[PDB]
Design an enzyme around this catalytic site. Structure first.
Site, PDB file in Angstrom:
ATOM      1  N   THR A   1       2.846  37.675  40.757  1.00  0.00           N
ATOM      2  CA  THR A   1       1.975  36.758  39.973  1.00  0.00           C
ATOM      3  C   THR A   1       0.525  37.246  40.089  1.00  0.00           C
ATOM      4  O   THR A   1      -0.125  37.444  39.058  1.00  0.00           O
ATOM      5  CB  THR A   1       2.140  35.312  40.461  1.00  0.00           C
TER       6      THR A   1
ATOM      7  N   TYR B   1      11.770  33.497  46.692  1.00  0.00           N
ATOM      8  CA  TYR B   1      10.421  32.961  46.377  1.00  0.00           C
ATOM      9  C   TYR B   1      10.590  31.546  45.838  1.00  0.00           C
ATOM     10  O   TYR B   1      11.202  31.371  44.759  1.00  0.00           O
ATOM     11  CB  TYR B   1       9.721  33.900  45.394  1.00  0.00           C
TER      12      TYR B   1
ATOM     13  N   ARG C   1       4.880  26.458  39.982  1.00  0.00           N
ATOM     14  CA  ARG C   1       4.887  27.424  38.854  1.00  0.00           C
ATOM     15  C   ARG C   1       6.248  27.394  38.161  1.00  0.00           C
ATOM     16  O   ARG C   1       6.253  27.453  36.922  1.00  0.00           O
ATOM     17  CB  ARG C   1       4.479  28.810  39.361  1.00  0.00           C
TER      18      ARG C   1
ATOM     19  N   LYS D   1       9.645  33.417  50.841  1.00  0.00           N
ATOM     20  CA  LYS D   1       8.229  33.108  50.517  1.00  0.00           C
ATOM     21  C   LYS D   1       8.183  31.659  50.045  1.00  0.00           C
ATOM     22  O   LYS D   1       8.684  31.390  48.950  1.00  0.00           O
ATOM     23  CB  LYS D   1       7.632  34.031  49.457  1.00  0.00           C
TER      24      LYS D   1
ATOM     25  N   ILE E   1       2.357  36.057  52.750  1.00  0.00           N
ATOM     26  CA  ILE E   1       2.262  36.910  51.529  1.00  0.00           C
ATOM     27  C   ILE E   1       1.016  36.417  50.796  1.00  0.00           C
ATOM     28  O   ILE E   1       1.071  35.311  50.239  1.00  0.00           O
ATOM     29  CB  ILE E   1       3.563  36.833  50.710  1.00  0.00           C
TER      30      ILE E   1
ATOM     31  N   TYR F   1      10.947  28.188  33.582  1.00  0.00           N
ATOM     32  CA  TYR F   1      10.823  27.846  32.134  1.00  0.00           C
ATOM     33  C   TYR F   1      12.222  27.595  31.564  1.00  0.00           C
ATOM     34  O   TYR F   1      12.519  26.453  31.181  1.00  0.00           O
ATOM     35  CB  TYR F   1      10.029  28.898  31.351  1.00  0.00           C
TER      36      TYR F   1
HETATM   37 NA    NA Z   1       3.707  37.735  45.221  1.00  0.00          NA
END
Ligand code: NA
Ligand code: NA
Ligand code: NA
Ligand code: NA
Lengths: 309, 311, 308, 312
Positions: free
Chosen positions: C50, C137, C142, C165, C204, C113
């Site tokens: 990102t 992740y 998001r 993450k 991270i 999405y």
């Molecule tokens: Na990243």
């Protein structure tokens, strides 16, 4: 500077075959085993995604993946030369710059084919990529239908990045360049012996080294040997009876080092020629050919033809 | 069903291999392209090749190529036959380009034999068989560019398929007559042979470069009978157009006529100044009114031309 | 064997992708940023996450950037490709190509999405977990879909699952670490407490793009609430607008990236660029990447690119 | 001034179907099944179609597939229905290329979502929309549940100054819908279970619908023939069933059960399990099979009838 001289000193460069899994995706395990075999038998460079490597059938993401993979796994043990040329200047530029960014040692650049251009057009095309890194210029008028004339080679030789020429016109053209200090590799396996020893060629960019790399190293290094040249000629005749890479794809499948998977528009040599190949392997000796498995004829139905790869 | 779609391609006598004009930054000039296609329709062109050799299909990304075909079908497809050059030396590219072009309503496909990565007779047939079922198909034999002649045995075999419309043949009148005598439809790919091919060797017409410049005169050549006078009058123009590999000539001429910008995608570069002066003289011998565009033909300065590498 | 090397990393930089003025990658500037991360103790990079504007990359430039990073830096730092996607097809092809070019690990988000069922999410991860060491992740802010603990505990039984993450917060981090699962905080302003109080292996990080030395000190040299407090102004500035708007603006101000933005990102406005010059002076410019004096820049210094 | 007529031709549409994209067993588009779905929509009062929206799995298409499907739909159906390409992206570059290609091939309008996952500032969002708004009739898609970023009214009001802004596909709810309609901005509900009340009580022009894939005639009735609380209440069980897992898992399962699409899923989507497929057969009985697309008796289908494709 010494990057370009490191390319100029290579005598045996293998135009390596790209092997496939049954749905037409790359067989990275088979490919790694082929490149290892080439290193073990004294190949000093590989062309990745050349004509023998079926670069014309590759999507650009496969092709840069294969260059980056080959640099990552083998870059310390062999010089990796990407075939990043194209009849489109945009693709040649894009491919060559991505190629060098992933650490390839050199680029092979053909003149634009099918969509052929003027001498001025041809020079314009090569000037966009020659500055990016060490470059072999590829003249194969039997495929491109356009000769790169001596005047163009001489002008390109003024750039120190121009490592040399992969020449296929024949030994007179080879000599026209080598006698003026321009490095030449023969692109014609059945001419490379006479090219090396009688016409000042540094060596070969070879299809035949895919099958018998030790014998092709011997041919380029250990002085003239017209007996060895004559023993290889029947294999070279078999390999080029249909357009390359039809022979070498068929052969590597018979030797069991690649699966019998073809990306169209290539199809295997028929049964009659696969029986001939078994006789050629026995006459030369199986020990000189890549792989350990017994050579097979294979059935027609062993071969997989893929259009949607 | 497919028989009528194929017969609609076979009836066409004048097919323009339309030039693709560019904006100063190397993108497609759709405005200029639409004016070129309109000018072809108004002057009797019955079909158009989209992204042929002449249209620099070799330099397009596939999204550009597919879009131009769909755009030509959407705006002109009721007024002219739209034939997509969806051929490739890659069978995978030819399969996807062809099925997408037909799905977007193109009337036909032009399919060359694999060039550079040339294959066996068996390979060539296997290649053509993957796309010939998808709709009306013109097989393109241009061994001067492919460096491989499609032999008669391939053509006779492909002609057993009802989707095989005919052949764009560049080998000569002898090869043309080998097909037309058996009732296989042939379009000449050679502007300087097409008059004789049409009236003396059974060719249906021409897939033309010259029609980009003088569509009215090419239509007259193909419909109104033998005219050795008009064919000789055009020979100097055709010799000028092919002194360097097509489409360097047509690209230069269309900028001089003011109907496309003087923008070239490499590796093509314009004809030099002395040739552009020659062109002005040829336009005056034939008559500006027979050429596309209204603007006075210009010579153009060397520095009027833009060469794009990163398009 | 390979997965244990990723599990030890404490400082992983979500590295910024810098641009030439025509919108293409600035590889010279990229290489300079990665060399600085290495010199200042960064142990891994995420390539095309990102922060790296992976979503704005063409396929060939993402795969090229991963391969370039492995070739140039693979010996000095672990290279983790962000090869995840809301499309299983894209996740499969990018992940297998990333690993073929020699990346050490893959970062895999749950489909955003076009979000899917828990069963669909498990099917998606299974197509890529077998290819190599994988960090899962979770950033529900998001994706608008929280990966539930149930899913993470099931995936963690796969030895290719290196760890998580996690961006939900320190309670979520502790729920995983106390159950033996390796976690990197994805929240710069939580990573200190995460590391020292909640069993997190490290971070991270976005902020390590600006101050890699201070972020390394924060993760290695023990609890230090005063250094954490000293960074909180800079972290609040970096997240005023969605990442990577802050980091892109700051690295332009420091002169290590050109003021070139791929849309739909645009720079922080003038008032904020003036605040950043103050925050740099407050903290000390020697701690920030680059050698140039920190400039405010004019609004008209910034190139916004749509067609690249 | 043709721009004005083109944009107004979008604004007058009340039923727009977010059409499902059906697949062959190897994962490629089933153009035959697709043409039958679109023909059914036209015969039953659908006035527009979104090509490769969320329901149409545009997120799983390569752009060559997506652009082909837009051109195909314009070419085969463009005279009988309005074709709106979902040419939006979280990448401004992809949004510009897809949209200019879509319009060049004759699509009537574009659906533009705000950047998702890689979300941007208000300033960034405006910059993104301004690159595509000039290309032709544009519907702005606000779906905060999927993008995790609400397009705030200040942004919509600013965009509505452009004559090419046809209107909003709004999913926030009836109160947001009313904020826009009371100012004269055209709104379609993107919530099937809200679209009846949005239409008759909050000034929505109509619906961009998932449910019209199954019962197009009933959805046309809901949008044209006045308030009908009873009909709206009778569709609710079907609408809850369609959204118990994220769209388009429900509509993909249902269209397989009705035999108008093959039971083929592109990952990361997978079918509703057996208990839900049995519920679907019940919902179809309650409403009447005659109101659902297709002619074949509804089936439950076995787990093993479903094909999941990752490498399509
Ligand atoms: Na990243
Ligand atoms: Na080669
Ligand atoms: Na043509
Ligand atoms: Na939609």
């Amino acid at each position: 500077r010494t990057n370009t001289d490191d390319i100029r000193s290579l005598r045996v460069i293998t135009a390596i075959k790209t092997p496939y899994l049954p749905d037409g995706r790359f067989d990275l395990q088979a490919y790694d085993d082929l490149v290892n075999t080439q290193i073990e038998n004294g190949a000093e460079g590989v062309i990745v995604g050349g004509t023998t490597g079926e670069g014309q059938l590759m999507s650009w993401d496969e092709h840069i993946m294969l260059i980056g993979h080959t640099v990552n796994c083998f870059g310390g043990r062999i010089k990796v030369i990407g075939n990043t040329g194209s009849n489109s200047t945009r693709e040649a530029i894009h491919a060559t710059e991505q190629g060098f960014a992933m650490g390839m040692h050199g680029a092979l650049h053909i003149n634009p084919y099918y969509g052929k251009t003027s001498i001025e057009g041809m020079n314009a095309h090569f000037q966009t990529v020659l500055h990016m890194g060490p470059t072999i210029i590829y003249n194969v008028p039997g495929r491109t239908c356009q000769d790169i004339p001596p005047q163009v080679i001489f002008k390109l030789s003024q750039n120190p990045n121009m490592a040399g020429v992969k020449e296929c016109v024949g030994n007179n053209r080879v000599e026209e360049y080598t006698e003026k200090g321009i490095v030449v590799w023969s692109g014609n396996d059945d001419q490379c012996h006479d090219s090396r020893w009688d016409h000042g060629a540094t060596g070969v960019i070879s299809v035949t080294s895919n099958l018998v790399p030790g014998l092709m190293r011997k041919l380029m290094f250990e002085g003239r040997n017209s007996a060895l040249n004559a023993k290889l000629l029947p294999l070279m005749d078999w390999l080029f009876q249909e357009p390359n890479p039809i022979g070498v794809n068929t052969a590597l499948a018979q030797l069991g080092v690649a699966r019998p998977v073809f990306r169209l528009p290539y199809v295997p040599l028929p049964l009659s020629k696969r029986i001939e190949f078994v006789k050629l392997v026995k006459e030369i000796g199986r020990e000189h050919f890549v792989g350990d498995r017994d050579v097979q004829v294979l059935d027609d139905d062993d071969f997989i033809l893929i259009g949607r790869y």
